[PDB]
Amino acid sequence: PFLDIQKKLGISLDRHFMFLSAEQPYKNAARCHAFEKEWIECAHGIGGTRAK
Amino acid sequence: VKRFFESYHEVPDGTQCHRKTYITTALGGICGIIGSAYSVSLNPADSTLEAVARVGRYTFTAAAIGAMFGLTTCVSAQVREKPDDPLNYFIGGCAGGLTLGARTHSYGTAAMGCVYMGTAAALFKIGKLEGWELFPTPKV
Amino acid sequence: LDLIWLEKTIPKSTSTLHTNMTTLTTNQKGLIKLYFMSFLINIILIIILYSINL
Amino acid sequence: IRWTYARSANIYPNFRPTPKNSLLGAVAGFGPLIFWYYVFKTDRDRKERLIQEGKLDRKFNISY
Amino acid sequence: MMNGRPGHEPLKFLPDEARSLPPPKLNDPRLVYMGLLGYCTGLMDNMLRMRPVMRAGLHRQLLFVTSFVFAGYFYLKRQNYLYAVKDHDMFGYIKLHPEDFPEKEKKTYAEILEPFHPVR
Amino acid sequence: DGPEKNYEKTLAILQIESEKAELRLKEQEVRRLMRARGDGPWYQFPTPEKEFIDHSPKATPDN
Amino acid sequence: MLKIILPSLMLLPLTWLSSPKKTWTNVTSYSFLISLTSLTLLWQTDENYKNFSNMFSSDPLSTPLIILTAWLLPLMLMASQNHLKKDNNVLQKLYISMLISLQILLIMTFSATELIMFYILFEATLIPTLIIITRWGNQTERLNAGIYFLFYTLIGSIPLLIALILIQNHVGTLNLMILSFTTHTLDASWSNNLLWLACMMAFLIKMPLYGVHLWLPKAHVEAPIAGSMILAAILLKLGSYGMIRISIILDPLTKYMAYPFILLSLWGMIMTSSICLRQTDLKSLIAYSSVSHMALVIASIMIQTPWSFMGATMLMIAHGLTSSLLFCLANSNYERIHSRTMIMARGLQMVFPLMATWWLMASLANLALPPSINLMGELFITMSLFSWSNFTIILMGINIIITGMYSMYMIITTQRGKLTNHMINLQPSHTRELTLMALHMIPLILLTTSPKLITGLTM
Amino acid sequence: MNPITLAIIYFTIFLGPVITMSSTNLMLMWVGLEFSLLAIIPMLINKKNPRSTEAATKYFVTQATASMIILLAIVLNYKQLGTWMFQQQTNGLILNMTLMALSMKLGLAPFHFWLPEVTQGIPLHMGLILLTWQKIAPLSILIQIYPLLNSTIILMLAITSIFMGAWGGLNQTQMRKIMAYSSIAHMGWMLAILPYNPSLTLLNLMIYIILTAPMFMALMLNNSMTINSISLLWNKTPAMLTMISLMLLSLGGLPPLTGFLPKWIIITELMKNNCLIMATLMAMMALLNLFFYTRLIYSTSLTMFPTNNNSKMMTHQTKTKPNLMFSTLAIMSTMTLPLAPQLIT
Amino acid sequence: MPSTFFNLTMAFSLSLLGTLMFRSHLMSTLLCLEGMVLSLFIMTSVTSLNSNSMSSMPIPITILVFAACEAAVGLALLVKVSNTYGTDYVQNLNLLQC
Ligand SMILES: CCCCCCCCCCCCCCCCCC(=O)OC[C@H](COP(=O)([O-])OCC[N+](C)(C)C)OC(=O)CCCCCCCCCCCCCCCCC
């Protein structure tokens, strides 16, 4: 986000449902949960260009 | 039309003058169609007949400007044996400005169009000779 | 030269060109029907530009 | 006051472009420039050719 | 471009690494000009409120000068930190990729042949 | 004060300006390289957050 | 340089804090002291340049311009403190503030060591002269004159900014000495030709070059006396100084790219001298004479000869002094008769003998009477131009003939002849304006006595 | 308006862009845009005249259409990638639709036709609130996706924005229309520098805001909506002519004003990225902008237009209208060029 | 699903085309806006149901809430326009050109 008030305060107003592999009601896994988890685990920490 | 305008530059100047004139006429016609669409949308005519008459007049004017530009540029390149000369594009742009003035019935508009469009076409030829980027991707 | 043709060439011709252009661009009718038709033309032109640029 | 105003500020309001004064202005604004251009270009080209082929002698020209 | 750097605290004005930087001298032309701008702001405010320009609102002028100097000092410290961390990242990247920044050997003016253009 | 003062002041000024020019050119090259292949601190474009992914066992075992 | 800049800055609080009965006296005295302080830049006992700081430096070219600016500030105050007697106190102090800001910014511009700071102070000097011309001008056409001046200068200066940023990106620092040492020869492509035109056209506009000189006559006519003085005596020279500073990194393509501008300069000086021959307005005549002299300066800087550079510097200083003097004499006649018509006041030699002597001396300086620095600059420019091409002597000779003709025509039609006896409102003379004429003429005599001060960079 | 509805409407006006800037989710950014639009409509139509009604209607339908296109882009991205953010591999068509809709919300050409008309017919304080506060959230959305945008379409939008803003400001005499075309030109500059360095976009936005705020305050002093109305300001408030002239010159980008700094540094960054043709064309149209500013200065400050007889009674009366924050913003928008390395990052 | 999503996208395109191509009725323009809204809702709902994204299922309801607020404000503005002129004619809403 343009302002990181959520990260500064430590709260998660909307950061916990940003994708399919996020928190789901009654642990009902979405489609391609494993694939999206692998993609995020790969892309984390290296930046957008290196992720692409 | 991307590969069309790229096939404008696949041959050096002074060669395929008919192809260059056809491509420049097509580009001028496209620009005239866009301008006529904007004109009839922002300032609509009294009826559809005069609306399409204005569209046809604008399209023909811009197509004639482009055709005269390409023809005079390729002809000057042929007769001076200098394909990489911005003066050929200046002559073509001045011819296009004279075509604009003839279509608009104004010698002052003809002179202003000649000077401005000749400068623009010379700058375009210089840019294509020396690798200028009109819309560069961000590098730094 | 000075009182006629240099004035006719550089400053008065520049002012005449920009006055004509500002009249042509601010000759709006104030109709939002025409404004939205122009916006539609802009949308179509952006789509065409993206499709030819790829 | 009328004479000064007519000589200074009324000329461009009362100027209309005609082919005759367009031709006169083009000649009087470019012809001397083109003429002196060709004069100076020919003179300096001859001087540079003589200097490059060594046929022009600079006797004591040290401060140019 | 520097917002995505590692160790970037979000919405942090002066992080602790800025404490390694030397502070502004507190009598330096940037802060002196900030105080001058505050005094000019007070004078202009008096003139727009149709008060005497200098002899009216001394507390207001003092508050203007003080607030301008205070904000300018802390903002100047932040900008000094930003420029310092920019140079730190640049030097670190250069040290990390030396093959992309080779030390070119500049020859002396005895092996290179500059073309001579005579003015005559 | 004499000519040596102005001479050595000019030397110091020239050294400062030459170092600044070399630093600016190096900064341009650094920015270009990082933007082309982001691997330094700068131009690190974002990525979805890893900590907001469920790893608890779920209803469907094929996850 | 800071010891000159700081008290000139402190002149503004002096202006706004002085009593209304003491403002002119205090500001004039302390600006004279500022000029006396500025005279210390002539202490050049070495071949080096007085690089005072990382952003301020002195030069054999920059120093006479700085001294001329600091000398012209009190003369501008003396010239302008008569047509502001029926004026509000805060408006008088604002006018003095405009003059002081012009002097400060011009000193900083001439002492700048970095071309981006030079451009910033260039536009900073563009602002208050526009304010002076528009606000304190007399006729209706001052607004059109200010627009012409402002936008000729701006359309010139924008590609200069683009070119300066390009050179800064290519080299790294845009510092004058660094460029002078690590100058690289351009490969003479179309891009380099456009770069040359971009970095030269701003200075050519402000010189002014012929064909683009149309802002100058109306600006000088509609300007007040101090604005005319500062314009004709500093700002054209600022354009020439910019040309000399920027021409060092334009080798070698200035050799062939200088061709249209030399022709424009020579034929334009002939045309403008002819306009002076047929001109019905005295300030217009002085303005077109300024155009011809600056055309000579343009031609010298374009041909890039050491004799040409020295003659350019000497003509810059000499023309600044004599053009300010001519404008002050014309303004004295304008404050007498409330008109600028050339032929209206004729027999002024009878009523104003000492002012006629000042008129005669100013015109003899204008037509380059030897051994004055006017003739020194014009003669060395002629020598360098004849070395460049032997056929330039025809244009030079025609220009000299018409120059003497319009100068002596001005003298005869303004001083000689029968007196216009209907002009009952001819006050004898002001000690202020006679002092102003003396303070213009005496530095011309002193620089004639010692011409080594204004030779410039080359010698 | 009672204070309850004043607090509700102003808090929602504040909360819209705040939610948009603080939101990670594209949907929450969109509902922040919805908050801003819905909350700002009643204050636009607050005066309840036919012109205010027309302005509110035009603004509503324009922003609603642009928000629907934004929502289309968000839903298409959610379909393609399964997430609620344009991460790196979203479709270029989706990104171009996002850019086009955000440019229609911002009001830059050729989507600019409503902005002078909406700015006309509303009170001056609402014009200020519009032209400063309403552009922060769309600019934040554009800034968050800066490496993904298309430089060709962005540069075309920017150059036509600056051209049309210069020509419109040249033609208009109404002060609100002049300020709107000024907004169009400055938004063109911000969009031009957006894909290369959004820090300069933020710098130009802040400079434009601190220049636009006191100009609108000085208009708000006497409700001068016309060139003539601001021209007789010498009789009403003679002490404001110098600051008016300095702020208009700063809007023109003249050195040594601090408004030269955004155009200067944007041109510098474009030269670093080799877009010299675009930079030069933008600079020439900025000169045209400076021309209509200079004509405004000639009307209000350098000359003295004839006054009225009732202006004597207005000088008899006393005013307390210029607030404490006017002079601070005027000075910070006039004399801050020597702090340029601190103003840039 | 892809043919259905293409048809929904074309439905949104038609509703946007109707919004951009005005006729005399501002109410008809608002109806075109509501049709765009409906197409967006159906696209989001079928995407969430296809991807089993129950966490993102509140998003279509939020879309409906904010879009209904938009429609409410549009109806209020149409009330003001009709009180001014007697009709909802966009040709009557034209006097801000000068
Ligand atoms: C006062 C006169 C005003 C008009 C004349 C101004 C100068 C005319 C000649 C220069 C071109 C225009 C200015 C360009 C500034 C930058 C120059 C530069 O960097 O050049 C190198 C650059 C080239 O960049 P480069 O040097 O990096 O080239 C790369 C080369 N290789 C790859 C081999 C390493 O030239 C340009 O970019 C020029 C593009 C100009 C396009 C826009 C022109 C618009 C119209 C200009 C005039 C407008 C005002 C007058 C209008 C009419 C009034 C009557």
Contact C31 I21 (CB under 8 A): no
Angstrom distances, CA of residue A35 to CA of A31, G357, I2: 9, 99, 21
Nearest CA owner, ligand 1 atom 25:
G191
Q: How far apart are CA G388 and CA G303, in angstroms?
A: 7
Across H157-181, b (16+ Cβ under 10 Å) vs e yields bbbbbbbbbbbbbbbbebbbbbbbb
Angstrom distances, CA of residue A25 to CA of B11, F48, F58, G126, G313: 64, 20, 10, 69, 85
Nearest-Cα distance to chain G for F15, in Å, is: 10
- In single-letter form, the type of residue at position H159 comes to I
- How many other CB atoms sit within 10 Å of the CB of residue C48? 13
Nearest-Cα distance to chain A for E35, in Å, is: 31
For tokens 């959230």, the residue is: H137
CB G379 within 8 A of CB G258: no
Give CA angle at G87 (G84, G93), nearest 5°: 75
Report helix angle H50-81 to I2-20, nearest 10.
160
Between the CA of G159 and the centroid of ligand 1 the distance, in Å, is 7
Chain B interface includes G190 (CB < 8 A) = yes
Nearest CA owner, ligand 1 atom 13:
G159
Q: What experiment produced this structure? A: cryo-EM
Between the CA of E51 and the centroid of ligand 1 the distance, in Å, is 51
Q: How far apart are CA G40 and CA G52, in angstroms?
A: 13
The residue in chain F having the minimum alpha-carbon distance to the alpha carbon of residue B140 is F32
Choosing from B90, B123, B125, B134 the residue with most ligand 1 atoms within 8 A of its CB, the one to mutate for a pocket test is B123
User: DSSP 3-state assignment of I89?
Assistant: strand
Nearest CA owner, ligand 1 atom 23:
G191
H148, H194, H274, best to mutate vs chain B, most B CBs in 10 Å: H274
Residue E110 lies in a domain: no
Give CA angle at H42 (H40, H47), nearest 5°: 120
Q: How far apart are CA H76 and CA H91, in angstroms?
A: 9
Closest listed residue to residue E45, CA positions, set E65, E27, E28? E65
Tokens at G190, concatenated: 């179309």
Residue H240 per-residue DSSP state: G
Percent composition of chain F: helix, strand, coil (DSSP 3-state, to 5): 60, 0, 40
| Cited resolution, angstroms | 2.9
For tokens 């690089």, the residue is: G51
Between the CA of G210 and the centroid of ligand 1 the distance, in Å, is 21
What single string gives the DSSP state of each residue in B108-119?
Answer: HHHHHHHHHHHH
**Non-local CB neighbours of H53 within 8 Å, separated by 6+ positions:** H45, I77, I80, I81, I84, I93
CB H41 within 8 A of CB I77: yes
Helices then strands, each counted (H, E), chain B: 5, 0
Residues of chain B positioned with their CB less than 8 A from the CB of F40: none
Closest listed residue to residue G57, CA positions, set G245, G314, G317? G245
Closest partner residue to E114 (CB to CB) among G185, G305, G387 is G185
Between the CA of H112 and the centroid of ligand 1 the distance, in Å, is 29
Contact C1 D28 (CB under 8 A): yes
Q: How far apart are CA E24 and CA A12, in angstroms?
A: 38
3-class secondary structure for chain G? CHHHHHHHHHHHHHHHHCCCCCHHHHHHHHHHHHHHHHHHHHCCCCCCCCCCCCCECCCCCHHHHHHHHHHHHHHHHHHHCCCCCCCCHHHHHHHHHHHHHHHHHHHHHHHECEHHHHHHHHHHHHHHHHHHHHHHCCCCCHHHHHHHHHHHHHHHHHHHHHHHHHHHHHHCCCEHHHHHHCCCCCCCCHHHHHHHHHHHHHHHHHCCCCCCCCHHHHHHHHCCHHHHHHHHHHHHHHHHHHHHHHHHHCCCCHHHHCHHHHHHHHHHHHHHHHHHHCCCEHHHHHHHHHHHHHHHHHHHHHHCCHHHHHHHHHHHHHHHHHHHHHHHHHHHHHHHHCCCECCCCCCHHHHCHHHHHHHHHHHHHHCCCCCCHHHHHHHHHHHHHHHHCCCHHHHHHHHHHHHHHHHHHHHHHHCCCCCCCCCCCCCCCCHHHHHHHHHHHHHHHHHHHCHHHHCCCCC
CB H82 within 8 A of CB I53: yes
Q: How far apart are CA B105 and CA B108, in angstroms?
A: 9
Residue H300 per-residue DSSP state: I
For tokens 């010299």, the residue is: H276
E116, E117, E119, E120, best to mutate vs chain D, most D CBs in 10 Å: E120
3-class secondary structure for E14-79? CCHHHHHCCCCCCCCHHHHHHHHHHHHHHHHHHHHCCCCCCCCCHHHHHHHHHHHHHHHHHHHHHH
User: DSSP 3-state assignment of D52?
Assistant: helix
Domain ranges of chain I: 2-98
CB I53 within 8 A of CB A22: no
Please report which residue ranges of chain A form alpha helices under DSSP H.
5-9, 33-43, 48-51
Tokens at H153, concatenated: 């379409």
Which atom of ligand 1 lies closest to the CA of C11? Answer: 54
| Domains of chain H: total | 1
Residues of chain I positioned with their CB less than 8 A from the CB of C36: 19-22
Residue E106 lies in a domain: no
Q: How far apart are CA G189 and CA B90, in angstroms?
A: 17
User: DSSP 3-state assignment of H46?
Assistant: coil
Angstrom distances, CA of residue G120 to CA of G106, G159, G201, H283: 11, 14, 17, 15
User: Which residues sit with their C-beta closer than 6 Å to ligand 1?
Assistant: B 123, 130-131; C 10, 14; G 155-156, 159, 162-163, 166, 191, 194-195, 197-198, 201, 205; H 276-277, 280-281, 284
C2, C3, C16, best to mutate vs chain D, most D CBs in 10 Å: C3
Tokens at G350, concatenated: 């009878």
Report helix angle C11-25 to H151-171, nearest 10.
100
Cis peptide before H110 (omega within 30 of 0): yes
Angstrom distances, CA of residue G293 to CA of E39, G367, G372, G396, G437: 46, 10, 15, 11, 21
Tell me the torsion sign for CA atoms H178, H180, H185, H186.
positive
Mark whether G and A touch (3+ CB pairs within 8 Å).
no
CB interface of C with I, residues 13-42, below 8 Å = 28-33, 36-37, 39-40
Contact E100 F41 (CB under 8 A): no
User: DSSP 3-state assignment of I25?
Assistant: strand
Bridge partners, G114 (sequence order): G175
Tell me the torsion sign for CA atoms B75, B76, B81, B84.
negative
Which atom of ligand 1 lies closest to the CA of G159? Answer: 15
CA G392 vs. chain centroid, Å, equals 25
Residue B137 per-residue DSSP state: P
Nearest-Cα distance to chain F for G36, in Å, is: 20
Distance linking the first and last C-alpha atoms of chain H: 43
Q: How far apart are CA G415 and CA G418, in angstroms?
A: 9
Choosing from H276, H278, H287, H290 the residue with most ligand 1 atoms within 8 A of its CB, the one to mutate for a pocket test is H276
F1, F6, F15, best to mutate vs chain G, most G CBs in 10 Å: F6
Tell me the torsion sign for CA atoms H113, B47, I19, H73.
negative
Tokens at F46, concatenated: 């974002």
Residue E13 lies in a domain: yes
Q: Phi/psi at G281 (nearest 5 deg)?
A: -125, 130
Q: Which fold has domain I2-98?
A: Helix Hairpins (1.10.287)
Nearest-Cα distance to chain C for D34, in Å, is: 16
Which atom of ligand 1 lies closest to the CA of G189? Answer: 33
Tell me the torsion sign for CA atoms I3, I8, I14, I16.
negative
For tokens 């911002």, the residue is: H106
Could you tell me the residue range of the domain that residue E93 belongs to? Answer: 1-97
Residue B132 per-residue DSSP state: -
Q: What is the CA radius of gyration of chain A?
A: 13
Closest listed residue to residue G107, CA positions, set G37, G200, G157? G37
- In single-letter form, the type of residue at position G84 comes to L
Neighbours of chain I (3+ CB pairs under 8 A): A, C, H
Between the CA of F7 and the centroid of ligand 1 the distance, in Å, is 39
Q: What is the maximum span of chain A, computed from C-alpha positions, in angstroms?
A: 35
Please report which residue ranges of chain H form alpha helices under DSSP H.
3-22, 26-44, 50-81, 92-106, 115-119, 124-133, 136-144, 151-171, 175-193, 198-222, 227-231, 233-236, 241-251, 260-272, 276-297, 311-316, 324-334, 340-343
Bridge partners, G175 (sequence order): G114
Q: Which helix (H) or strand (E) holds B89?
A: helix B86-104
Residue E106 per-residue DSSP state: P
Q: How far apart are CA H54 and CA H46, in angstroms?
A: 12
Q: How far apart are CA G358 and CA G336, in angstroms?
A: 16
Give CA angle at H135 (H130, H140), nearest 5°: 155
Residues of chain B positioned with their CB less than 8 A from the CB of H152: 135
User: DSSP 3-state assignment of B105?
Assistant: coil
Residue H299 per-residue DSSP state: I
**Exposed (0-12), middle (13-18) or buried (19+): which is G251, by Cβ within 10 Å?**
middle
Nearest-Cα distance to chain G for E8, in Å, is: 30
3-class secondary structure for H134-168? CCHHHHHHHHHCHHHCCHHHHHHHHHHHHHHHHHH
Residue E112 lies in a domain: no
Mark whether H and I touch (3+ CB pairs within 8 Å).
yes
Cα torsion through H166, H171, H172, H177, rounded to 10: -30
Closest partner residue to C46 (CB to CB) among H96, H164, H170 is H96
Residue H298 per-residue DSSP state: I
User: DSSP 3-state assignment of A28?
Assistant: coil
- In single-letter form, the type of residue at position H54 comes to E
Give CA angle at H101 (H95, H107), nearest 5°: 135
Tell me the torsion sign for CA atoms H126, H130, H132, H136.
positive
Neighbours of chain F (3+ CB pairs under 8 A): A, B, E, G, H
Neighbours of chain C (3+ CB pairs under 8 A): B, D, G, H, I
CB H212 within 8 A of CB H183: yes
What single string gives the DSSP state of each residue in B34-64?
Answer: HHHHHHHHHS--SSHHHHHHHHHHHHHHHHH
Tokens at G100, concatenated: 């002081």
Tokens at G140, concatenated: 């209706």
Chain F interface includes B131 (CB < 8 A) = no
Contact C45 B34 (CB under 8 A): yes
Contact B133 H272 (CB under 8 A): no
Across E54-87, b (16+ Cβ under 10 Å) vs e yields eebbeebbeebbeebbeebbebbbbbbbeeebbe
Q: How far apart are CA G322 and CA G328, in angstroms?
A: 10
Give CA angle at G62 (G24, G308), nearest 5°: 125
Cis peptide before H50 (omega within 30 of 0): no
Which atom of ligand 1 lies closest to the CA of G156? Answer: 1
Contact H87 A48 (CB under 8 A): yes
Q: How far apart are CA H285 and CA G145, in angstroms?
A: 21
Q: How far apart are CA G283 and CA G342, in angstroms?
A: 9
Closest listed residue to residue A22, CA positions, set C13, H173, F50, B13? F50
User: DSSP 3-state assignment of H277?
Assistant: helix
Nearest CA owner, ligand 1 atom 39:
H277
**Non-local CB neighbours of C14 within 8 Å, separated by 6+ positions:** none
Bridge partners, G112 (sequence order): G56
Q: How far apart are CA H117 and CA H140, in angstroms?
A: 25
**Exposed (0-12), middle (13-18) or buried (19+): which is H320, by Cβ within 10 Å?**
exposed
Nearest-Cα distance to chain G for B45, in Å, is: 38
Nearest-Cα distance to chain I for A4, in Å, is: 22
CB H322 within 8 A of CB E48: yes
**Non-local CB neighbours of C20 within 8 Å, separated by 6+ positions:** none
Report helix angle H198-222 to H260-272, nearest 10.
160
Residues of chain H positioned with their CB less than 8 A from the CB of C21: 167
Q: How far apart are CA C7 and CA B126, in angstroms?
A: 30
Chain F interface includes H82 (CB < 8 A) = no
- How many other CB atoms sit within 10 Å of the CB of residue D51? 14
Q: Length of chain I in residues, anyone?
A: 98
Report helix angle I2-20 to C32-53, nearest 10.
140
Contact G178 F22 (CB under 8 A): no
Bridge partners, G281 (sequence order): G341
Contact A14 H25 (CB under 8 A): yes
**Exposed (0-12), middle (13-18) or buried (19+): which is E105, by Cβ within 10 Å?**
exposed
For tokens 């400050």, the residue is: H301
Half-sphere exposure of A28 (CA within 13 A, CB side): 10
Q: Phi/psi at G175 (nearest 5 deg)?
A: -95, 140
For tokens 């020239």, the residue is: F14
CB G14 within 8 A of CB G87: no
Angstrom distances, CA of residue G342 to CA of G406, G412, H228: 12, 11, 38
Tell me the torsion sign for CA atoms E37, E38, E41, E46.
negative
